[PDB]
Amino acid sequence: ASRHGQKGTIGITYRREDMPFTAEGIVPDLIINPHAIPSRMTVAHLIECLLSKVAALSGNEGDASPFTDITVEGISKLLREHGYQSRGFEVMYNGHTGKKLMAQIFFGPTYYQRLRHMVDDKIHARARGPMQVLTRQPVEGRSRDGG
Amino acid sequence: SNTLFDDIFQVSEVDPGRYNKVCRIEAASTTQDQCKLTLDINVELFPVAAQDSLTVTIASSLNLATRSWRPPQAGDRSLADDYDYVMYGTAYKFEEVSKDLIAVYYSFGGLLMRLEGNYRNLNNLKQENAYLLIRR
Amino acid sequence: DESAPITAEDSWAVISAFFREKGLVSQQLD
Amino acid sequence: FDMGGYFIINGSEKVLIAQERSAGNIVQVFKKAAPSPISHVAEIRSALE
Amino acid sequence: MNAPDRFELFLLGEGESKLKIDPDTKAPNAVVITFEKEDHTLGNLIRAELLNDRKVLFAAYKVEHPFFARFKLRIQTTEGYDPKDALKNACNSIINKLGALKTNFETEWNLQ
Amino acid sequence: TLSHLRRTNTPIAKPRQLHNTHWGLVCPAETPEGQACGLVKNL
Amino acid sequence: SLHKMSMMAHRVKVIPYSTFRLNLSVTSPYNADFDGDEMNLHVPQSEETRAELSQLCAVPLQIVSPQSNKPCMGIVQDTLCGIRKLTLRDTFIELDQVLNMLYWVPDWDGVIPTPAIIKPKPLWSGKQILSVAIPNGIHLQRFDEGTTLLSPKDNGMLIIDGQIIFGVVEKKTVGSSNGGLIHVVTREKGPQVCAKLFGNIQKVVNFWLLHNGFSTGIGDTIADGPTMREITETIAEAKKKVLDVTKEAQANLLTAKHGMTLRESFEDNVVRFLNEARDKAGRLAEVNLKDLNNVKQMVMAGSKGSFINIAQMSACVGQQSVEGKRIAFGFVDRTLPHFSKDDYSPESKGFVENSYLRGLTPQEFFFHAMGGREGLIDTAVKTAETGYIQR
Amino acid sequence: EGPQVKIREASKDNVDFILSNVDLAMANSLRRVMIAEIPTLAIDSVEVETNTTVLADEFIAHRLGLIPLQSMDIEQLEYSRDCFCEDHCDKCSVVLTLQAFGESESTTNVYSKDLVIVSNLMGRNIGHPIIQDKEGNGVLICKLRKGQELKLTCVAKKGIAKEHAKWGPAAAIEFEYDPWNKLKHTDYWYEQDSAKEWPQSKNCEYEDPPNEGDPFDYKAQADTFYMNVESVGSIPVDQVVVRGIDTLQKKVASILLALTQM
Amino acid sequence: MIVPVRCFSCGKVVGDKWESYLNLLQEDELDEGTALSRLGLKRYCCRRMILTHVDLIEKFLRYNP
Amino acid sequence: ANWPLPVNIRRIIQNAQQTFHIDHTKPSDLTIKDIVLGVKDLQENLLVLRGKNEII
């Protein structure tokens, strides 16, 4: 999950080469889907990426505190001076054919956190395991081999 | 095999509406005062303007229906060696608006061609999968 | 100068002093 | 970095969540939507400190 | 359980060839070849070379599912052109390009 | 850990609504979702 | 699991490492989405059971939901968003790529359709390539507003023997629509075919989308300088509407129509103005935005969002509410200690005028918390009530 | 001839050049070779004897894996599965050991340089840890204070990045063609004008301007790729491209070879 | 917690770059953004790594073994 | 005018045209005798119920 309630699991892991890459050879480590944004209106998650891309380049730390005068432009115009597109976009190439993507990509670092719900602590199956004592229906609880 | 219909067309108007690669054509025949044509045209492979004298053809086939496409080999004696722009498609409506003036509708994979005129010229064009050839 | 009115930014020092004297779990201790 | 605020019971950390309650020794005025003859009730939970 | 060792990832699995040339039904003188142990890096390279061939009618490939080092490839030549040997032509062409290119690259670097 | 040590509880007018007076005394955001919503607040 | 849909029989494809995988289009009937949701699977134990699954609870058979006699499953994701981009008139595909896309159709006959453009550079259009996945004999037409056999704005839809003729493929055509295409396939060629339809449409569009790409960025919410200014005029004019009404009430002038009090009537015009103002302002946003703007592409495809979302992101958050009314006076005559008493102006009673693009002020922000919270409590209650009632 | 090369600049571990007169697919296909399918040597197996650090065993063991070693003569070794050896052999692997002991009262940092070969090399130039810093120190492996010890023995094996990223001969691979968007392969998202907003690429000057005011050459193709390899340090850059081309040459040769099975 | 080996995205070996980086601030009092210019992580797939790393292992060593 | 109903007739007609390739500008080979009768002939096969009593 990000820092904006966009929790989601991993779909699949792609190797380094197959991932899309910008002109500088930087392959993103994580890809999320656009359709999450308009419905949830989590604009902040976009800005943080925009701000962070500036912070890493310049060396500042993004003063992302809630109520300041920091506009988008102040980040945006600042970004332009570093030689990247003002809105955080970036030309990117498909990793399969190495052909320019017809559309640009929003890109940049963003804080991500790992959550407890690992798959290995949620998956189980049962084929004629132990039953209860009172009712002789199968027991509950994956730890105790539930049903 | 034979040109199902041919005429020389002057663009009464071009509408470059709303898009980057396609536009509208307002063609009025100098030859006949009643054959008006509207057709989507790709600007990139055929830039246009007002009052452009354009040859228009139909050409049900190119020989000089169970035919998988293949690239031309070398100077093969197909048509459009005299023309410059070719689109393949198929009509989907015959409409008789009025007196023997008859109008037709063709779609070239999303590119649409509306052509109208008297009956006697347009008898021979009956819903066949047609080509389209343009020069000048 | 020292008599001039303060800007918004200076309040963080106050907040930093506030946490320095109290800490986050004051009331539990208090 | 640990800052206390919690007791240790038989080797287990425990925390007393703050509890909430209405004010003591305070008068309050309530209506009564019910058809009960008491239109308004001026409740007060008194207490000795 | 399920996760394979990685010599079978690129070296041939036992008993079966690295490729499976399969006669096709849709078109005469057309074929499908199943390349095991390899993926895009080899695949898309092969496909582009084929298009150079004039006598080739149809040539495309796809990767079935991202979990495997396999991908299909469908080649359709004109009549009187064996796809196997039609494929054979492509490989020599590429290696000749590479073999030249390494020499060409060596030259520039060796001039430093 | 820190949030836990600053957690409030409330046994069961309508308390779940974020009341105007809650301004700057309890967090207008941090509240567990579900059976506890509104009932559990944090300073 | 409160549908007959919510349980369906599948076919097992054993796979590598430990998750459950399913086709994307089936995510709708389950109301499932990979936010970490878990799903149980059951294995029959007898031939009679197995048949009773594969012959009654078959995923293809559940396509036409008897709940509302319209398809419950459709092409609903990026695939939907992507396919719209594939069906524009401006879209074209070169031969080299057209071969792979064709190959992706598992049941493709083995024929290369003649490109819609030759001389020069034989070129294809998405509509034809898309038509390959559509089985032959399918016929369907939709004549929306402004529809014409000429189709100037390319609305509507028309297919003939599995060949798109004009129209832009979108939710209103391939989504879960009453007269949608997927509805027709089921009735015409049975449901069994219609399963193959998903297997074709998806892999094609996804493959093409993967090589055309699609993304959204901050700029997608940015409005033009002029448009932002026009928005401000729209907001300001609303205040004047409010201001005059406010004083009229203070002069004992406003006359409530029969059936509600003066304050009751007074609130009606106030709220109606603010909602009008926002919705009028949102119109400024949606009209202005370039067709390149992705969030307008997604909205037009219908795959996510709506008009309201882009209105709040770009134009204005609008008026918060509680119990249908504005933010009442929690304190004495005033909503917050930051205001003087008796302030019915919209920014005091709980109207946010800023937009998510440029953040909210505290007073505004705090209000939005209450308005946001009220949904959570309600959503919690609806889970409590609706679930019980349904039982 | 065939495709052409031209070097612009070359550092100790970076090389920039311009690959011209070659199909787009091969250029990309070359890229994917360099990133993943190149042989390389890295620590594979660890057997911790004494650990008293504030760090987990596998933690330290994992970091040991990501330590680059000199691997010029990697071909002079045998793939781990190919040997009939008993879990390793001098011709199959390189055995590395490390003894670290905090003795100074201030913290004693453990560096890559403290690794030592404890096996025969047969004169190979492989197994030496790469020291890319000028200051002779290795990569900071672990910090120790007096009273802590670290005795372990690593085993380095010939691996390929496609398995794990440790065997990665290369780092970020810059890659670009058609700096001016004259091939129309991309539509520039813009608010007022793409040109004012999208900065020009560093290589836009190296090719002629778009020469606006002319029809777009629809039948033109793509060449003149501006790649830039950046070796991590295991092998010099010149090898990377050369060995990458070599490997790609091998695989296609393998197809043609396997094709002869009839 | 201690100077991660090569940056996840790029892969430029970054472990040796740490102490030099630390040497800069306590001695030359550079700005970090200017520092890395002197340091040589000109890309930003690494320029993140040193910038936002936490050196927790230092506080770990405060515990007598 | 729109009400949810059983089998669609609009769509059925379309298939007929596209199946038989209706050659317009032609006289139909139908008889008015057949049309009216055929409709009434068909209407006695739409058997929701199978019984034979008056009630059914």
Next chain:
Amino acid sequence: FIVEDDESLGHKELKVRKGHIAKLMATEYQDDVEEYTWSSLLNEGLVEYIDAEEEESILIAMQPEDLEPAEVDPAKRIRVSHHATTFTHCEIHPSMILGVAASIIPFPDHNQSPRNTYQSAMGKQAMGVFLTNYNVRMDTMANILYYPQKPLGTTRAMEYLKFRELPAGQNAIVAIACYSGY
């Protein structure tokens, strides 16, 4: 803060000025000892303590220099003015109305409010480093993150949560794209 509407400057102004602000930071950067603490502010009566009931009969101005003195980028959020004059208190910093979990959210005022709630929920179950002595605690089901990282888009408050010293995640490089449909 305590507002003194009486002032020779012709308008309201705070009882706190640069001097104390200077003095406050002086105490911090000592690490000669004077320790001019927070309590000294209360002892000087520059900042007041207020409960809910006391809030009933006061007039709190939002930002000090934004409103206390009497009397343009559209991208700046539109605010209200200081038409009112009879203030008594000004908020120390409006961002402090949030809790512990909430404060970590970058740009929360740029979010749909329920989203903030969700982050505050998950943020409690964010894998990280809970204490620096985890090697001697024998607790059940402890979780430690291999290579933590301070967030790039930090928050002014976050420094006061020691978050920069005990982070709970990594700065991943994320590209938003319908790339492979997965």
Next chain:
Amino acid sequence: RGNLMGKRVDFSARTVISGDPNLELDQVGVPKSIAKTLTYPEVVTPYNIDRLTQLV
């Protein structure tokens, strides 16, 4: 309720889900681990004896 109108069962599994466009609509991805655990009985018939024997 808890034991007649609803009861636990064997031959069932639960885990997390994940999309995959490359599956036929009526399919489902199942981890090979579960497949090795869950099982469905089959009858020894002449048509499948050898195959079933092979599985043994």
Next chain:
Amino acid sequence: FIKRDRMRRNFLRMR
């Protein structure tokens, strides 16, 4: 307009 760290020496300058 970002965070700051180096204002401390001004106090020494103020001293």
